[model samples]
Target: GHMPEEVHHGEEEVETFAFQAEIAQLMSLIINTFYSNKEIFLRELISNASDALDKIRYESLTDPSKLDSGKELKIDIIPNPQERTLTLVDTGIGMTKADLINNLGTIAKSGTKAFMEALQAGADISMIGQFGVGFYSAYLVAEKVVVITKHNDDEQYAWESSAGGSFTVRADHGEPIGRGTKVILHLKEDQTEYLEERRVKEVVKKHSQFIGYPITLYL
Candidate 1:
């Protein structure tokens, strides 16, 4: 039963990946240019949480058991002003390790390439502003971000990035959230306003007021 050396250490295996070239470039642009309304960061995060909740709801209709913990679906915005971090937790169909890499790691993998080509070709460049890079908006206020997620079928994973050209994903050794994702934003010094519960609640209501799940702000 003793596997090879490379196959033995699964628990602490850490993998670091470079953001695709275009993605790195787009991230810089987004972090710098998209400050017109930074509150959208909370909006985008809630939208993503809602989508995950919807997936679980849809799946539960068929399997029923997917509604773990008695079918309570919600989002929690926990702010630690002392630590200067804002955590958004959602109960939903959490991601497997691979899902975190594929979805968050390479969001606009190909679209960014096409957008760059258009820029070089002197075509309309305004469309680049509309790409669905909602998740990266966290970089607008966060110096670093960590996504801890667990699925019913897979072990939990923590994917971390500083929006610096690369990111790391590893098996999470932290307490599990049953089945969901927690996005922790390490707030930049100047972005500490997000660490205030009142400010966070306002942002959620301003943009995600129509969302279906109950979003609770921990005071």
Candidate 2:
């Protein structure tokens, strides 16, 4: 046999990969059994929006243009009872299709794994994972989640998902949403409470009163 070329690689070149069937089962089991309260889904989404706005504000301190240069930071809640859909739009940093996949598709291993391990070890599982898993919680109440977004560097785009294991991303067809993100929640019949203007406003006021941006409710 021909002599193999002399090769020298640093430890960094080595890679490790393993499958965790147990972890997958545990995750599925927990998602199916432990998540009972669905109202928190809305709260989580609002909180995430607030966090996004806060992030934009922080970034703007140094780079002014990072914070929706022409648009003010705000949250808009629109409910369509006839269509049984609700939308939560934020004039903050919008995401591209690739950003959607990277942010929402995979579980952040460090955060999610640590949280799961702690819960399995009898630690209080009350604390929500700070890893933005809240976005996926939309599936708890919505049959489909449509995200329309416009980023500073890209054209407006839409991402749709049924919460199964896949999603679709394409150019937005409607009027261009100037500069930010809009999430339309196709509410499940049992989750109709989220479609009520009064209820949505109440939740926004109660939990997001201090949010830097104005929160608007649209019926």
Candidate 3:
């Protein structure tokens, strides 16, 4: 049966995510790479957002209605310096309950690792993978991470965690979002140094521009 092009799944209260693997190893990464690490997590996040927006739109070929959000691919980032919070929204392939567990709960899809391997294999910079494990780098700057996403096939859900062994996901009973994912990052005290509009533009231009999408930063 062909599902209606505009199926509204609405909200389903809440559901807990039972992770299959322990994220202890991943969190251990935080201790290894000190906050003073040269790389910027904001760069990796935009890269992730860019890949998501691209892949979600690409999925449109298999199912036309999968992308009824809009014509252009756009990533909107709202920064709240006062509260030390940064939110990034992408019109990308949002996650289902299953996706939240499978995609995030596991660190197997290491895009950076794959990219490095490809580089060794002589693959050029153009052969980047979709949003993968680099998302874990969020722990470097954020004390807590919140992800709210809506997919056509599933009700809107919000996943919150402190990057421990487990995370929680619950249906968003509030208003309905169009069809996308929003990531909220509660920045750490010292990392707040570079979480500004000026730095956003530089990182976007450095990493996200190559992804062939538009990333807008808001004050």
Candidate 4:
């Protein structure tokens, strides 16, 4: 496929997402606090997938067509121990190229604002801050994290990050996902434990068992 016709120029616009100055500091704060425990990456990601599924399903309540016609709401974990990769695939609320930019970028910015405010004036904040920042936690174990996603509103797009304070998103020319997102983690050296089926299950059990969606970690 030659991208898609809906994109403004060629395919979706090429956009680079960056963290706010406050977000960068907050990131430094959390990673420093949890640097010893990298396995939390799976917990955060699975929680996010569940939220995605819930979001889409809820939207469909108001408009039936909001849900993907062909995709089911679920999460699939594919771990390739030999290749040192752990991928999470979800048929949920996928992202448009602009959505990729806005959601990921804004989440961090909002979290950072709350963080500094909380520190300064004891403001109230909750998981919303973690929802966005958690994706960056993948950098705790991965050298690179790639996201391939599609939304009913736009063509499939590939977003990649080296966890270098910025990320890039462009139209993906591969087979369409029809709906939802796939997050692939390229493990760092000696971080191969993430690719083990047993390890993944344990993490899911400990952190994601209460999630509403069915999560399958398989061969």
Q: Candidate 4 — which residues are off by over 4 angstroms?
A: 1-17, 24-34, 116-132
What does candidate 1's lDDT look like per residue over 1-219, in tens digits?
887566565455899999887888867766565345787788878888998899999898889988764378999999998889899999989999878898777766777767667656874433444555567778889989999999888989999988788899998979878898999999988899888767877887788889999988886
lDDT of 4: 0.75
Task: Show how many residue pairs clash in every candidate, following the order shown.
Answer: 0, 0, 0, 0
All candidates: CA RMSD (Å)? 4.5, 10.2, 8.6, 5.3
Better of 1 and 2 by TM-score: 1
User: Candidate 3 lDDT (Cα, whole model)?
Assistant: 0.69
The superposed Cα distance between candidate 2 and the true structure at residue 34, in angstroms, equals 7.0
Candidate 4 structure quality by residue, lDDT tens digits, 157-215: 89886656777888888877778999999998878988877888888888777888888
| Model 3 Cα lDDT, one tens digit per residue, 89-165 | 88787778778766776544355456556656875433332324557667777888888888777888888878666
* Stretches of candidate 1 exceeding 4 Å from the true structure: 1-12, 111-130
Q: TM-score per candidate, in order?
A: 0.86, 0.74, 0.75, 0.79
Stretches off by above 4 angstroms in model 2 are: 1-36, 65-69, 107-126
TM-score ranking, best first: 1, 4, 3, 2
List clashing residue pairs in candidate 1.
none
Model 4: how far residue 10 lies from native, Å: 4.0
Two-way lDDT contest, 1 vs 3, winner:
1
Q: Which pairs of residues have clashing backbones in candidate 3?
A: none
